[PDB]
Amino acid sequence: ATRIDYYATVGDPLCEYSYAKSGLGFCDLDVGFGDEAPRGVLVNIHYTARFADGTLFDSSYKRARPLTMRIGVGKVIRGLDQGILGGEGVPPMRVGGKRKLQIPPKLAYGPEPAGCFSGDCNIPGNATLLYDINFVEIYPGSNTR
Amino acid sequence: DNGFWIDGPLPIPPIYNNIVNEKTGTRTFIKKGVYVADIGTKGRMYRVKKNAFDLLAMEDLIGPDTLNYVKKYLRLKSTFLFYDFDNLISAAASEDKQPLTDLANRLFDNFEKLEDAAKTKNLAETESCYKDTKFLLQEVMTRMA
Amino acid sequence: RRLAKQTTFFDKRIIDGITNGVGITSFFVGEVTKYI
Amino acid sequence: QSKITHKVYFDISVGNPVGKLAGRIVIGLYGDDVPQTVENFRALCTGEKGFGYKGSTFHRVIRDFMIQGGDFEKGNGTGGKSVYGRTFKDENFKLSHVGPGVLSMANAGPNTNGSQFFICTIKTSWLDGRHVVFGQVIEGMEVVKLIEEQETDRGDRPRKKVVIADCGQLPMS
Amino acid sequence: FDGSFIFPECILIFGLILLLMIDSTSDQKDIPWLYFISSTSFVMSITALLFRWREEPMISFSGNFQTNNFNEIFQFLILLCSTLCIPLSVEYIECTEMAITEFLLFILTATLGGMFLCGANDLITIFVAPECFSLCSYLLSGYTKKDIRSNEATMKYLLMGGASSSILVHGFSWLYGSSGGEIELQEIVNGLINTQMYNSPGISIALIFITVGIGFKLSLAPSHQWTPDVYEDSPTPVVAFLSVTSKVAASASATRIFDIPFYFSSNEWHLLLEILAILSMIFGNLIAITQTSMKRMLAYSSIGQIGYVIIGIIVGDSNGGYASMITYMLFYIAMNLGTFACIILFGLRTGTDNIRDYAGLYTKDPFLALSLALCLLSLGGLPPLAGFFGKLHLFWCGWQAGLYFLVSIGLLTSVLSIYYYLKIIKLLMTGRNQEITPHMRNYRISPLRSNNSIELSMIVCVIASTIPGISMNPIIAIAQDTLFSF
Amino acid sequence: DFPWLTIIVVFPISAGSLMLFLPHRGNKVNKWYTICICILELLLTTYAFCYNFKMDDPLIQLSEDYKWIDFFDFYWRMGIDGLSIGTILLTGFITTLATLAAFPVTRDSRFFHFLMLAMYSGQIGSFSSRDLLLFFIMWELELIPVYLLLSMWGGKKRLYSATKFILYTAGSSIFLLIGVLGISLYGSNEPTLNLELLANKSYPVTLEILFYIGFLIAFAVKSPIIPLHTWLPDTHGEAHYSTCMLLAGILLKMGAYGLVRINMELLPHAHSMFSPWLLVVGTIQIIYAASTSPGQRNLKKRIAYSSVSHMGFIIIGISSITDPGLNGAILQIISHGFIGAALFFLAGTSYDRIRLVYLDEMGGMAISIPKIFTMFTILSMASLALPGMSGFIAEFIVFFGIITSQKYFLISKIFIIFVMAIGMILTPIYLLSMLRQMFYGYKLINIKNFSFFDSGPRELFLSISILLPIIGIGIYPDFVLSLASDKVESILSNYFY
Structure with a gap:
């Protein structure tokens, strides 16, 4: 619920969510140009993650570095893997690409308050998160393992 | 302006509404900092004579490989003459004011020509300009005396 | 002459005292933090 | 440009020196539609409060977009507490981003506006309703281009620290 | 699964098999050729690393080893340390009638452990390779076996190093736990937010335990009490090897496990290192003033030099990169192994390591006195020598990034170090026929x-402490192209 | 055209590095080798100064720029001003006569003369470099060699004085490094180090004052400013005469010259804020260092404080925003270079002859050493600001720059001139107290059995050779003004607007 870790950003372009069959609200903004997002490698992304009403709780620009995630092998949320690679034929991301995502709680952290360090929690139950992924690059040296 | 040690720009002494300048700029032989003593109109009238006599008796100093000291003594005593003519014109009788400032203009144009000849190490042009500036120096000496 | 003795006192004792006290204090803290 | 009420300025200094005074950014404020945000911005001029924009940076610059700034506790975009305690709400999104030279205040999302703003450069009319929009540049848009064209870094920060040297209420109102 | 990127390291272990083969057949009849095959193994690994310079930072094994240009540089520096220290102990072993065999094993495998620690990426390898290093270190320190002071010294070394690694790996455990169940540093920070524990007390505890263990492994001034007790007792050549090599490998780790997995908390982290850095710049350079030993005050001066290195650790890759830190570790190797070589020659000819015995070396040996004086002046850095310009690059990056309290304190303590360096140079330039000792009076260079x-x-x-201060532009240019440390 | 200043600067080191071992185990060979090298270097300097240096152009002559380290933008900028060529010729003259005076040294004379040549290169490198970081290099390069020819040659408590000096000078060179770091990094866009490109920058006052503090704490110890001056009476007063005549002759003038280069024409709007207080500091410095000198029983510490006193006029001329003030500062740099050099030389030879230090002992030695007596008297007269010597015209042109100052007003000018000219009452007191204590008298136990040796022809030539420029500049000051005055205008043009 609370602990937004207040980081006033500017916002991102709004666009309608061409939903997926797995419940994922999927929304491409800027199609990348380069190699596809490979299933199993470290990929550097930038993102702004927002709750339902739009409040920001996490962003890679807050820590001023791309986020290095291993996509596909479940190190991340299922919404992230299904909105970066695409399971049900959803188009994957390319390098230098941007993409909006409305992560549903079925794919997001369930009805479980993911992250509860003292009294209050980073994520509330049934959050229906909102990600704004900016795929910046693949990790320059990466393995499919 | 804290009494002792006025600070900041270290201003030049001003030019009090006279046409003694060049009209394409102020003047070029002006030494930046010289302590011209505010004596009084008779004292200025005599110090004009003395500095003009100096510039007049600067005849020996001119020669090959000596023009730097010529330029230095020129700009010095001409700066003295400049500020003294300024205080004399500003304290003139308003009927000898106009001939005196025209005299100062036709004297200082010649000092400018002389400085341009000596700074450039031009000896023959320095002396050929020293001729008529010597005429003008004797002229101001017999005016003030 | 009294003023000269006074001024060389001020120089050698309590303005060279600071310059030498920097070194005395460095020696002393070195020996202290060596033995503590 | 609906009813510029308060002209105010903050003068910047790009580059290595702090007091180079690289132009100034004179801006008008719509103090009638939005009293809370404009009163906040007038207060962040350090006029009656120790905290203020004087000494703060423009901590994010993006080409052909917006130049963010206005955090004074920190320099990254976290400490932006307003005059109304820490963080206040949004107000009456009547007007829109008219295009170049706006003063839309920056918030995380709804009803969490702070001290941080951003000067628009290109026509971003798709921030309406999310971020409260007000204010407008009236002298010094080429200084805004001078901020924008600076080479940025991995963190989208300007390589040269774009600091605000002063921020005072102009005598217009 | 062809992991060719580790060919400069596997060479070493390949050579190590040969070492044991020479320990197998004849068992006594190979004194010089054993050192020969070891040195050629080092240089073969070096030229293989230089041959594999142009490759991408490709992670070879199943998420376990990143052969970056940064880690390549640090592996090159560890191999340089080993190759410049491998002829330091060709005579110390025959002096203390110890076995050259298995000392070469310990040196080669400590070099291997450092080489792997530089390129290590798993929290397993940031534990196994430092422990290869540390266990070989405990073995190298307790190698003379001529008394009981060195034995208790190396036993306390073993205990405190094990506790150091245990604190470090408790922090790694909290990394592995708070980050879901993720290791492999690049995925660790993704784990801290996939589970939303980036803003947790557990990850702060992980940072504190990790940086405490690193300051132990870097001898930073709070966590530093082991080096004075353990470098006095351990034999001088492995003192040189382990001091320089452990500090450069632990600087590789203190870049790796801080910039990649701990950047999100990089504010708090910086303060920790800053505190340690300031302390390691002060107390070290404030202790060695009042020390009568030589290896001990060299250890404290090394603490001060690493305190200067943490300035380059604190600054990121952008606002003055890790090139200053790299070239200062280069000069630190070059101008500390020379000092330890001079301390070795003064101790293979005189016998002792007390500092009052150095008085009078200018008369007996002008070349050795000149070499030690030039090396110490490089360490202090008055004229354009290596360590002066290295400190200059460090303070340049620190000023540019905006660390004024690091740079100013570092300069104060640079003066403070200049004092004791010249206190050494007082002795080995002076001489009065009684201020010398009966260990300096009988020096005997020629009976050799x-x-x-x-x-x-x-x-x-000595050359590499003198001219690379002058010839610094190639070193800066080859250290600036390490921008892939992230 | 030709690398002139480079073969000026590197030549002493590159010719003393030819003494690697050089198996000649007497002082003769290296003594003559190094005095020959010093003469050759002085002649190279003069042939650069005579036939390849225009004395009218107030700009950088014999310029030369290389690329040493690209990251710092650190070049090998060399250059000669009007206010730096005089200090360079003084470096040549005084260091040459210093290695002449070091003829009788034979302890480790190879190392001594090599370190002399190292100082000889480093000082001209500091005076001839138009790069800030190179100015720092050649500042700290005259720190170790001076230490080594101060701690192993000359002085009873030489080790204390040497470590005090090296740590004080390093603790101020770090402030210099703070200054060059500040200017280079936080100077402007496109950060640089070349002073020729740097002298026309903005430097707002809140940052210019910071740079001025960072550089004034550096130059306040080298030209001793009385909060920070305690290194000198220990360093000079416990050093050999050959080292001390360049510690006061030319090493003290960097810091006075530095206050002209990197403070007066690089940070002018901040110097306009700080010079009012540097004036009060220098006026108090003259009196303080002229009243401490009667307090010294020692002979050599008396002359060290004398140098602290005569640096006050340079501080005053620098803080005088005038052409006469700064021209008097440069002229006093050179004049006191000669004076203090020869005075420390004669005090060292007097200690070698007499083997007494304090003035309570060492009564009448005039009949014993009359040549030393007369040369010491003439050079005390030159220290006295006596006409016919350069000290007078220096310590009068600085007064004239005060009384013709546009910065200050009469209420302050009166106080400043009064406190300055008490200095020339107190300076007779200590100088003639030294003379009447060490030379005027008769000691009944010294009648004939001692019969000390007089000033040999070498030492007599030293003193006379340093005297003749003092006389020549007292009778014709434009041997020193004419090489600087034009450049001084190029300073003051930055001050009046």
């Missing part, structure tokens, strides 16, 4: 095997 290879590495270190 030959013109050793100790002197070769000593004059190489």
Whole structure:
């Protein structure tokens, strides 16, 4: 619920969510140009993650570095893997690409308050998160393992 | 302006509404900092004579490989003459004011020509300009005396 | 002459005292933090 | 440009020196539609409060977009507490981003506006309703281009620290 | 699964098999050729690393080893340390009638552990390779076996190093736990937010335990009490090897496990290192003033130099990169192994390591006195020598990034170090026929095997402490192209 | 055209590095080798100064720029001003006569003369470099060699004085490094180090004052400013005469010259804020260092404080925003270079002859050493600001720059001139107290059995050779003004607007 870790950003372009069959609200903004997002490698992304009403709780620009995630092998949320690679034929991301995502709680952290360090929690139950992924690059040296 | 040690720009002494300048700029032989003593109109009238006599008796100093000291003594005593003519014109009788400032203009144009000849190490042009500036120096000496 | 003795006192004792006290204090803290 | 009420300025200094005074950014404020945000911005001029924009940076610059700034506790975009305690709400999104030279205040999302703003450069009319929009540049848009064209870094920060040297209420109102 | 990127390291273990083969057949009849195959193994690994310079930072094993240009540089520096210290102990072993065999094993495998720690990426390898290093370190320190002071010294070394690694790996455990169940540093920070524990007390505890263990492994001034007790007792050549090599490998780790997995908390982290850095700049350079030993005050001066290195650790890759830190570790190797070589030659000819015995060396040996004076002046850095310009690059990056309290304190303590360096240079320039000792009076350069290879590495270190301060632009240019440390 | 200043600067080191071992185990060979090298370097300097240096152009002559380290933008900028060529010729003259005076040294004379040549290169490198970081290099390069020819040659408590000096000078060179770091990094866009490109920058006052503090704490110890001056009476007063005549002759003038280069024409709007207080500091410095000198029983510490006193006029001329003030500062740099050099030389030879230090002992030695007596008297007269010597015209042109100052007003000018000219009452007191204590008298136990040796022809030539420029500049000051005055205008043009 609370602990937004207040980081006033500017916002991102709004666009309608061409939903997926797995419940994922999927929304491409800027199609990348380069190699596809490979299933199993470290990929550097930038993102702004927002709750339902739009409040920001996490962003890679807050820590001023791309986020290095291993996509596909479940190190991340299922919404992230299904909105970066695409399971049900959803188009994957390319390098230098941007993409909006409305992560549903079925794919997001369930009805479980993911992250509860003292009294209050980073994520509330049934959050229906909102990600704004900016795929910046693949990790320059990466393995499919 | 804290009494002792006025600070900041270290201003030049001003030019009090006279046409003694060049009209394409102020003047070029002006030494930046010289302590011209505010004596009084008779004292200025005599110090004009003395500095003009100096510039007049600067005849020996001119020669090959000596023009730097010529330029230095020129700009010095001409700066003295400049500020003294300024205080004399500003304290003139308003009927000898106009001939005196025209005299100062036709004297200082010649000092400018002389400085341009000596700074450039031009000896023959320095002396050929020293001729008529010597005429003008004797002229101001017999005016003030 | 009294003023000269006074001024060389001020120089050698309590303005060279600071310059030498920097070194005395460095020696002393070195020996202290060596033995503590 | 609906009813510029308060002209105010903050003068910047790009580059290595702090007091180079690289132009100034004179801006008008719509103090009638939005009293809370404009009163906040007038207060962040350090006029009656120790905290203020004087000494703060423009901590994010993006080409052909917006130049963010206005955090004074920190320099990254976290400490932006307003005059109304820490963080206040949004107000009456009547007007829109008219295009170049706006003063839309920056918030995380709804009803969490702070001290941080951003000067628009290109026509971003798709921030309406999310971020409260007000204010407008009236002298010094080429200084805004001078901020924008600076080479940025991995963190989208300007390589040269774009600091605000002063921020005072102009005598217009 | 062809992991060719580790060919410069596997060479070493390949050579190590050969080492044991020479320990197998004849068992006594190979004194010099064993050191020969070891040195050629080092240089073969070096040229293989230089041959694999142009490759991408490709992670070879199943998420376990990143052969970056940064880690490549640090592996090159560890191999350089080993190759410049391998002729330091060709005579110390024959002096203390110890076995050259298995000392070469310990040196080779400590070099291997450092090489792997530089390129290590798993929290397993940031534990196994430092422990290869540390266990070989405990073995190297307790190698003379001539008394009981060195034995208790190396036992306390073993205990405190094990506790150091245990604190470090408790922090790694909290990394592995708070980050879901993720290791492999690049995925660790993704784990801290996939589970939303980036803003947790557990990850702060992980940071504190990790940086405490690193300051132990870097001898930073709070966590530093082991080096004075354990470098006095351990034999001088492995003192040189382990001091320089452990500090450069632990600087590789203190870049790796801080910039990649701990950037999100990089504010708090910086303060920790800053505190340690300031302390390691002060107390070290404030202790060695009042020390009568030589290896002990060299250890404290090394603490001060690493305190200067943490300035380059604190600054990121952008606002003055890790090139200053790299070239200062280069000069630190070059101008500390020379000093330890001179301390070795003063101790293979005189016998002792007390500092009052150095008084009068200018008369007996002008070349050795000149070499030690030039090396110490490089460490202090008054004229344009290596360590002066290295400190200059460090303070340049620190000022540019905006660390004024690091740079100013570092300069104060640079003066403070200049004092004791010249206190040493007082002795080995002066002489009064009674201020010298009966260990300096009988020096005996000529009763020796030959013109050793100790002197070769000593004059190489002297040249590399003198001219690379002048010839610094190539080193800066080859250290600036390490921008892939992230 | 030709690398002139480079073969000026590197030549002493590159010719003393030819003494690697050089198996000649007497002082003769290296003594003559190094005095020959010093003469050759002085002649190279003069042939650069005579036939390849225009004395009218107030700009950088014999310029030369290389690329040493690209990251710092650190070049090998060399250059000669009007206010730096005089200090360079003084470096040549005084260091040459210093290695002449070091003829009788034979302890480790190879190392001594090599370190002399190292100082000889480093000082001209500091005076001839138009790069800030190179100015720092050649500042700290005259720190170790001076230490080594101060701690192993000359002085009873030489080790204390040497470590005090090296740590004080390093603790101020770090402030210099703070200054060059500040200017280079936080100077402007496109950060640089070349002073020729740097002298026309903005430097707002809140940052210019910071740079001025960072550089004034550096130059306040080298030209001793009385909060920070305690290194000198220990360093000079416990050093050999050959080292001390360049510690006061030319090493003290960097810091006075530095206050002209990197403070007066690089940070002018901040110097206009700080010079009012540097004036009060220098006026108090003259009196303080002229009243401490009667307090010294020692002979050599008396002359060290004398140098602290005569640096006050340079501080005043620098803080005088005038052409006469700064021209008097440069002229006093050179004049006191000669004076203090020869005075420390004669005090060292007097200690070698007499083997007494304090003035309570060492009564009448005039009949014993009359040549030393007369040369010491003439050079005390030159220290006295006596006409016919350069000290007078220096310590009068600085007064004239005060009384013709546009910065200050009469209420302050009166106080400043009064406190300055008490200095020339107190300076007779200590100088003639030294003379009447060490030379005027008769000691009944010294009648004939001692019969000390007089000033040999070498030492007599030293003193006379340093005297003749003092006389020549007292009778014709434009041997020193004419090489600087034009450049001084190029300073003051930055001050009046």
